Design a protein around this ligand. Structure first.
Ligand SMILES: C[C@]12CCC(=O)C=C1CC[C@@H]1[C@@H]2CC[C@]2(C)C(=O)CC[C@@H]12
Ligand SMILES: C[C@]12CCC(=O)C=C1CC[C@@H]1[C@@H]2CC[C@]2(C)C(=O)CC[C@@H]12
Ligand SMILES: C[C@]12CCC(=O)C=C1CC[C@@H]1[C@@H]2CC[C@]2(C)C(=O)CC[C@@H]12
Ligand code: FES
Ligand code: FES
Ligand code: FES
Ligand SMILES: [Fe+3]
Ligand SMILES: [Fe+3]
Ligand SMILES: [Fe+3]
Lengths: 355, 355, 355
């Protein structure tokens, strides 16, 4: 087909992007989780998210203004708090008693705004809180260079399978994976990789840890050496669903700044390092934009733990009380890359000799 | 959600626009009431409306030509009368006996073309005939300056609620409503308003009567004074449904011509008066294009008769024999604007003082 | 309505176009029969068609490359044969044993690529094989000048009715049909026509045989004389479904080259002959793009065998074992054009006299 669409959105923290982009004193609209949301900061700078359409007569709160700690609807100026409470009908004798719209719980981590989603309507388990990335604040590192695209005709689950995919590193990312291991446990699914650049594409040695913390947000630590020169990168791979067949895919890059040369040159290099990582990610995007998901895939041993990863991902789409132990218990596997590398080295060699 | 879509289009007269725009010797296509229609004038200039697709093999009658009193299909030239009768198959030995397509009953009032729609297929109650507006013919007034837009992702019921909306006059139209009363009876729902311009936006005094005559057509008489100079306007607010989630919204303006100065200057002023009224209407459009309808609204006393207006509007979506007395009996209410005006005057004052 | 959409695509040979356009050493994507297909030639130049999305993890085979006799998926380079077999996973210890994707049976006739479709999944009856057109190879004739358009909001059955349509030759093609006969038998439905140019449009005498061989592919032999000068044309009218409400309509023209004058002038004329035929076809396209299908048409005697043609066409949408004799037995009819021609000649005369 392949695969009945999910009937709920995933339970978890979803990143909506860089926090400071949701400030500038105004509210902002975001289409997400089958609805429209309004994001706004109160007078203390703390960020809030509500259902976007006013509970009075359907005005678009995202196109209103911020007055104090509330968002004012552009239609009749009703004031809504970050907790969803109707704080004031400015022209009325009586503001409604205990009126509320839906509030979405927020979090700011590493200069990124997150929103909690749960079909069951329960608040975040503190155990799944998205980790701080100290390097974001550190002035030894750049600040987020962020991107976003809308992908249509695809569900967001269609990109999670990359976690278990060893062989695509050769064909898509033009490198030779000499080490590959997955670990799934609780709310975290991880990929550990050693990757060597291909001689036949113009060598680099990459060590990569990448972990999804919950269903939608992956931090990828990139430790690359090109001879003796080490470089350090952190890449965010994240998304949020718009509908069950469209989603917003976002990536953000920071790099350790080279220490030290002219400020002007440090910038020039850091731009190259960043752009490089982004082109790496864009290689995956191109495949994601031009593929379908296969629910009943044809698999070889080298595919690794496709079924187990998907089983892990299922935990976010069932009620917490129905989470099965096989979704969350520690599972690990190392994929043997030896034979693939012998074959690939031959392909690489054949290509060099050929010119 | 909010609100299950209606399962039929409203029973009533719907305006398709300015009659003379449907002449120029040819037929015209209109998408309406979930189908396509053909509009055309016979040899006496009288305007007719049929289902647009030919009952023979599906040719588009709207792209045919007018021959005498019939529209000729562009495919095999069959002739269709304004009453839907198949008058002639030009090349055939025998024209079908008593063949008919669906005819739509028409009316021309005040230089505007109207069409009758009724799910039950009954002809117009003469009691709901759209009133003549003498000012249209009068050469003391301009001629219709008409506009139309297609609004998508909204049902046309989503704009009727403005009738009961006192408070939006301040936030959307930048005036202070010191008088506000609704009257609903039979097929007519009306709003009577006294409105004063806000000092803090750069004063005008407006008296307004606006009545929907049936479900889709509102005439608005605008009696404005700016000091000692009175001006008279008539504004048409009307629509027709295209689908249950798109509709065409149209507005038309005429003004009493200032009497009297140079013909050239009279035109110059009348253009300003007209453009002014249109910008008033466009303020509502902007809200209508950027909102949702709330089926179960959160209401304050100041909202007035939201539920009663909607109940009145329901009469057009039930079979005539099922019209309930509470939809059509006289209902009236005056909304007390005193407190709102004290509050608003304070807001206005605060803004002046602030600069 | 008119007409419930079909629930399967037609059983038959469908032309995807000119074979050589599907070569140039790469694979090609085609949206058809509700899915996406990949077309590619193996190392012997023989053309193949598979389901377009890889059975592994959903890569787009149409965007891969051809390696030897297989198409290589762009994601993990798996090799797929023209018969759908998984020939090789290049990096794996073991290629899957007896893995297959869906293969589509192909045929090349007259320099055109064809694909077999059958909901029942059975292979082509050799009896319905598309005939060779020797004139394609002959260097006394031009080579295919081919066109294609996507028609949206219409099912492909909506164009088959032209076969039975005598009267449209006057109104759409501006000629006078003095002879008209249909013959339906087995998998072939044909129209034989003698057509005379109208005096009142700026005379030509056309003899035309046009036959659908199966549900989607029509060959039209055009024998035209303009005085003493005969010209010979062959026109292909064909389509394939994309969805049940969109299809690709294609037409191809070849003409007997005038024998003989300068090579340069022979080309100049042949371009005119071709362009002429194409403008003839484009007259039908314009009606097809602007009409609906009528499931329960209003008919006159002159319509001929509308019901019988549709009954013939139904054979392709039922299981072979359920094909009813009345779909496939020989049916023929001649439509009497005499009276229509008297009437038309009068219309023509009236138009000449009028200027
Ligand atoms: C973020 C990412 C994609 C989605 C996924 O599931 C796992 C990873 C980790 C490896 C990343 C990759 C993005 C592209 C990267 C930067 C390369 O070009 C080399 C390493 C690789
Ligand atoms: C036509 C209308 C909208 C729809 C509706 O339901 C009722 C009215 C009557 C008041 C009109 C308004 C249009 C905008 C106007 C001209 C102003 O800017 C001041 C008065 C106001
Ligand atoms: C291919 C065709 C359309 C579809 C169909 O069903 C049958 C025919 C045969 C007659 C063709 C016509 C195409 C247009 C042609 C070339 C003319 O302008 C004169 C003859 C006519
Ligand atoms: S619609 Fe939000 S205040 Fe009225
Ligand atoms: S389709 Fe209207 S006349 Fe044949
Ligand atoms: S998706 Fe086709 S080879 Fe993996
Ligand atoms: Fe990747
Ligand atoms: Fe208004
Ligand atoms: Fe034709």
């Amino acid at each position: 087909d392949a695969g009945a669409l999910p009937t709920r959105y995933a339970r978890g923290w979803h990143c909506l992007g860089v926090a400071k982009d949701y400030l500038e004193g105004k509210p902002h609209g975001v289409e997400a989780f089958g609805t429209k949301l309004v994001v706004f900061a109160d007078s203390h700078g703390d960020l809030k998210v509500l259902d976007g359409y006013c509970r009075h007569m359907g005005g678009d709160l995202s196109e209103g203004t911020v007055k104090g700690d509330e968002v004012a609807c552009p239609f009749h100026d009703w004031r809504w708090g970050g907790d969803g409470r109707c704080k004031l009908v400015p022209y009325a004798r009586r503001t409604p008693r205990m009126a509320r719209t839906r509030s979405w719980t927020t979090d700011v981590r590493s200069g990124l705004l997150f929103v909690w989603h749960d079909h069951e309507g329960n608040p975040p388990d503190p155990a799944v809180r998205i980790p701080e990335i100290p390097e974001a604040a550190s002035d030894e590192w750049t600040d987020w260079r962020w991107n976003r695209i809308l992908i249509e005709g695809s569900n967001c689950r269609d990109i999670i399978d990359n976690v278990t995919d060893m062989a695509h590193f050769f064909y898509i990312h033009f490198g030779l994976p000499t080490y590959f291991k997955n670990v799934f446990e609780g709310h975290i699914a991880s990929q550990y990789l050693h990757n060597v650049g291909r001689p036949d594409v113009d060598e680099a040695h990459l060590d990569s840890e990448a972990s999804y913390f919950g269903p939608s947000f992956m931090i990828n630590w990139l430790h690359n050496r090109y001879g003796n020169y080490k470089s350090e990168s952190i890449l965010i791979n994240c998304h949020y669903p718009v509908t069950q067949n469209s989603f917003v895919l976002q990536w953000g890059v920071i790099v350790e700044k080279p220490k030290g040369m002219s400020e002007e040159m440090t910038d020039k290099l850091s731009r190259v390092f960043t752009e490089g990582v982004s082109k790496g990610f864009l290689q995956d995007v191109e495949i994601w934009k031009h593929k379908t998901r296969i629910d009943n895939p044809l698999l070889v041993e080298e595919d690794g733990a496709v079924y187990q990863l998907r089983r892990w991902y299922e935990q976010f789409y069932v009620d917490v009380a129905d989470i099965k132990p096989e979704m969350v218990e520690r599972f690990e596997i190392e994929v043997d890359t030896k034979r693939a590398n012998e074959f690939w080295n031959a392909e690489v060699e054949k290509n060099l000799k050929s010119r």
